[PDB]
Amino acid sequence: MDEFRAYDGKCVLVTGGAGCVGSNLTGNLAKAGANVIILDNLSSSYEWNIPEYENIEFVKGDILDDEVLKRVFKERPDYVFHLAAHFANQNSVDNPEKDLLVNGLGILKVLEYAQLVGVERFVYSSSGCGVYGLDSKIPFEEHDISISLHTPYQVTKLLGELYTNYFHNLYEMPIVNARFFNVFGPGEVPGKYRNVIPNFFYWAMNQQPLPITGDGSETRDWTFVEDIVRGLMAMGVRREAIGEAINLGSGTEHQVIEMAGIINELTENPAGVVYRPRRDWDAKTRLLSSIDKARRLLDYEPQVSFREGLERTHRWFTENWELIRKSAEF
Amino acid sequence: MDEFRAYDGKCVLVTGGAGCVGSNLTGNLAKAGANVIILDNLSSSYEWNIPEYENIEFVKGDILDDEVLKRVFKERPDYVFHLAAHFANQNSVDNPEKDLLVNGLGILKVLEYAQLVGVERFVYSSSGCGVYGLDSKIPFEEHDISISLHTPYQVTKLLGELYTNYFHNLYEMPIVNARFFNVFGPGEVPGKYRNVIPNFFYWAMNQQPLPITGDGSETRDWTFVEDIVRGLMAMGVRREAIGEAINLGSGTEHQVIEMAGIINELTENPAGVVYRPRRDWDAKTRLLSSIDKARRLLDYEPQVSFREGLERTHRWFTENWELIRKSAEF
Numbered sequence: 021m022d023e024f025r026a027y028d029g030k031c032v033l034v035t036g037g038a039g040c041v042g043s044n045l046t047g048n049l050a051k052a053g054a055n056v057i058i059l060d061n062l063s064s065s066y067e068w069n070i071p072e073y074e075n076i077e078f079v080k081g082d083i084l085d086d087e088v089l090k091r092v093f094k095e096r097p098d099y100v101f102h103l104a105a106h107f108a109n110q111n112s113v114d115n116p117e118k119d120l121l122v123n124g125l126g127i128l129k130v131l132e133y134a135q136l137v138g139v140e141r142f143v144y145s146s147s148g149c150g151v152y153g154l155d156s157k158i159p160f161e162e163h164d165i166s167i168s169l170h171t172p173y174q175v176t177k178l179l180g181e182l183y184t185n186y187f188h189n190l191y192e193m194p195i196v197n198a199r200f201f202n203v204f205g206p207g208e209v210p211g212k213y214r215n216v217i218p219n220f221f222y223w224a225m226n227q228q229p230l231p232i233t234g235d236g237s238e239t240r241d242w243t244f245v246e247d248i249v250r251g252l253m254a255m256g257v258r259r260e261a262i263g264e265a266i267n268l269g270s271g272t273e274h275q276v277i278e279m280a281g282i283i284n285e286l287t288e289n290p291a292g293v294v295y296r297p298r299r300d301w302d303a304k305t306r307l308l309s310s311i312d313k314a315r316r317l318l319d320y321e322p323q324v325s326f327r328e329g330l331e332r333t334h335r336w337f338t339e340n341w342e343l344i345r346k347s348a349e350f
Numbered sequence: 351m352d353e354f355r356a357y358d359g360k361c362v363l364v365t366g367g368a369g370c371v372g373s374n375l376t377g378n379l380a381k382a383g384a385n386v387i388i389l390d391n392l393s394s395s396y397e398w399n400i401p402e403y404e405n406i407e408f409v410k411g412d413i414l415d416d417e418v419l420k421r422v423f424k425e426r427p428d429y430v431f432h433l434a435a436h437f438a439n440q441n442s443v444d445n446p447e448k449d450l451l452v453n454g455l456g457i458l459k460v461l462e463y464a465q466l467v468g469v470e471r472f473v474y475s476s477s478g479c480g481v482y483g484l485d486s487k488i489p490f491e492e493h494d495i496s497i498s499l500h501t502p503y504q505v506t507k508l509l510g511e512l513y514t515n516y517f518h519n520l521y522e523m524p525i526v527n528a529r530f531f532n533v534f535g536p537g538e539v540p541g542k543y544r545n546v547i548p549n550f551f552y553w554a555m556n557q558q559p560l561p562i563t564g565d566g567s568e569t570r571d572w573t574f575v576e577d578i579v580r581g582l583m584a585m586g587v588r589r590e591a592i593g594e595a596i597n598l599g600s601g602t603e604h605q606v607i608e609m610a611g612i613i614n615e616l617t618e619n620p621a622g623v624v625y626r627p628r629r630d631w632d633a634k635t636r637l638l639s640s641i642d643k644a645r646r647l648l649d650y651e652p653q654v655s656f657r658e659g660l661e662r663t664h665r666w667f668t669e670n671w672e673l674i675r676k677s678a679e680f
């Protein structure tokens with residue numbers, strides 16, 4: 021609160037700033053007095069998702085385009101939050117080159133420009149799916165990484181860390197690698213390549229059965245977007261985060277069948293659940309992070325329960341239902 | 351010997367097959383009866399470097415070009431040795447995007463085509479510089495990797511492993527990741543971005559002082575090219591190599607000043623040595639691999655001593671001196 025007043029009067033660039041995390045993040049930066057610039061190509065998000073503040077400048081463009089990168093970086097951002105990404109697992113399996121260009125060459129370009137102007141922090145949204153392998157012990161600790169991965173998204177999420185660490189090591193760029201665990205909340209529009217919670221909300225609110233890809237006992241560590249954002253904002257300002265990879269998760273597990281049940285309950289869906297095979301790239305029956313490093317370095321602590329998070333997500337759906345129906349990416 | 355007769359009558363694609371490793375490798379495959387196809391854009395090598403055998407087809411082209419990839423992959427290779435790379439540390443620091451396209455997108459394309467036709471083995475030339483970090487214990491063991499790297503080449507060398515493991519994990523591609531340690535021998539032309547041994551030969555044979563970037567006590571594990579090739583050829587056929595990363599090195603250390611001394615002695619250079627600062631990306635005062643996994647899995651054993659290797663390298667230089675002078679990349 022008093023912490024985040026280091027953003028007041030600062031120029032902050034959020035690539036991917038119109039998505040779920042970005043929209044919530046830009047809103048909070050704007051409240052803290054930052055002059056926020058969003059760069060987003062609207063490939064998975066919509067302009068309507070951006071919160072309306074005088075001190076948010078929205079720039080439609082691509083991180084692969086050197087023209088628009090010069091346009092935003094000539095503003096000389098003090099902070100870059102790099103949230104632009106080709107999302108996610110299936111999308112990357114389907115389109116692995118595109119995935120590499122966006123997540124590999126895209127971050128590299130953004131880093132190169134960041135080096136040219138100098139930044140106080142470069143905070144990259146990495147992934148807990150992209151680094152903890154079948155041999156990593158649950159709950160996942162940041163040192164315990166694998167290079168044996170199951171999708172090109174996992175590959176390129178780790179690649180982004182390879183690049184931020186490089187720029188830290190050779191050029192002393194103050195980077196932070198935030199390993200997000202299954203983010204959910206207001207601001208993720210549903211669609212073919214999107215996450216399960218918004219799709220389950222969307223299907224349940226059309227009274228369709230929720231398709232479970234597995235037996236339902238698979239777990240995730242679902243982290244509410246507002247928790248993620250408080251994590252990110254601490255990462256921008258705490259010296260101790262510099263050069264570190266840090267999990268941002270809830271630190272608790274929930275079963276897919278529980279999550280489906282809550283969503284059916286909240287939406288008064290009568291159609292229940294149907295079972296489908298496990299997706300072939302999905303080797304993870306469990307994901308669970310250890311958030312002790314984030315507590316230590318950032319005084320991070322999740323504040324929003326799984327249930328409260330689902331309820332908030334539901335409210336977002338009901339309040340923007342027709343817009344979500346127009347916008348859904350199936 | 352009896353081992354390598356599994357290559358007889360087989361189609362083998364060697365990307366980067368005109369370089370130092372590739373030229374030596376293609377020659378040996380040709381002797382074993384393989385129908386060898388080289389794909390090489392001649393960016394750091396020359397056509398004169400390719401050994402003359404009836405059963406080597408040379409295709410000038412780039413791994414980034416989908417047309418030429420269709421041309422070679424329609425031959426349906428049983429084996430791919432992927433040696434095409436953007437080389438190396440300084441080159442990558444200077445040209446990091448180019449580096450990513452060649453080492454990241456290039457390997458990804460080659461892997462995608464390999465998946466389309468099916469291969470018996472996909473052997474990738476990774477690097478011992480690209481994966482063992484400042485915290486990795488010497489002698490370097492294959493599990494003991496870092497994601498904190500010092501050049502984009504190191505980054506993209508590891509990226510190639512990320513991709514081969516992916517294709518192994520999702521699509522059961524029989525891959526092998528060969529982590530080469532400072533290769534040297536006949537077939538590396540000297541130049542601005544090239545390795546120290548050929549440049550030291552070139553400078554010494556022009557009676558110029560050998561520039562040492564450091565104090566001279568820094569060590570490498572220099573591995574003679576013919577040893578590397580015997581490693582690669584075992585990797586193509588041994589079931590036990592499938593899915594593995596395996597160091598190919600000498601397993602011994604030599605100081606830079608020793609190496610300079612030998613080269614000055616061999617070339618009768620009178621100009622001695624001069625000292626220059628450590629290159630800023632070069633955090634490695636020592637590199638030394640553990641080759642116990644290669645012994646175990648491939649019955650690999652270096653046969654050529656450092657000294658014998660330097661003498662052979664020298665012979666190559668004297669025998670092709672004028673061609674090397676025309677060809678040098680400074």
Ligand SMILES: O=c1ccn([C@@H]2O[C@H](COP(=O)(O)OP(=O)(O)O)[C@@H](O)[C@H]2O)c(=O)[nH]1
Pocket residue numbers: 108109149202214215216217219231232233234238239240276302
């Ligand atoms: O339509 C779907 C999509 C996902 N899942 C399950 O929900 C969890 C999270 O899936 P998501 O695609 O949101 O994230 P990821 O698998 O990438 O963590 C996984 O255990 C899936 O098996 C599901 O049951 N039905």
Ligand SMILES: O=c1ccn([C@@H]2O[C@H](COP(=O)(O)OP(=O)(O)O)[C@@H](O)[C@H]2O)c(=O)[nH]1
Pocket residue numbers: 438439479532544545546547549561562563564568569570606632
């Ligand atoms: O012109 C040079 C180039 C390299 N080296 C040294 O020789 C070793 C190997 O350098 P090279 O560039 O061949 O390989 P790498 O550093 O990538 O292992 C290193 O310890 C360098 O400091 C040197 O003394 N002079």
Ligand SMILES: Nc1ncnc2c1ncn2[C@@H]1O[C@H](COP(=O)(O)O)[C@@H](O)[C@H]1O
Pocket residue numbers: 035036037038039040041042059060061062063064065081082083084103104105106107122126
């Ligand atoms: N190449 C790109 N350039 C700029 N923005 C992008 C690019 N790719 C994806 N995005 C955006 O980045 C955000 C990523 O959020 P998500 O889709 O949750 O991963 C979305 O708002 C996308 O529209």
Ligand SMILES: Nc1ncnc2c1ncn2[C@@H]1O[C@H](COP(=O)(O)O)[C@@H](O)[C@H]1O
Pocket residue numbers: 365366367368369370371372389390391392393394395411412413414433434435436437452456
């Ligand atoms: N993009 C590329 N496509 C095809 N061959 C390449 C490419 N980049 C480099 N090469 C070749 O790959 C070999 C790599 O050997 P080296 O230069 O020792 O790393 C050389 O013969 C190069 O000419």
Ligand SMILES: [Cl-]
Pocket residue numbers: 153154155156165166167168
């Ligand atoms: Cl592992």
Ligand SMILES: [Cl-]
Pocket residue numbers: 257258259260
């Ligand atoms: Cl601080």
Ligand SMILES: [Cl-]
Pocket residue numbers: 483484485486495496497498
């Ligand atoms: Cl490390």
Ligand SMILES: [Cl-]
Pocket residue numbers: 587588589590
């Ligand atoms: Cl065997």
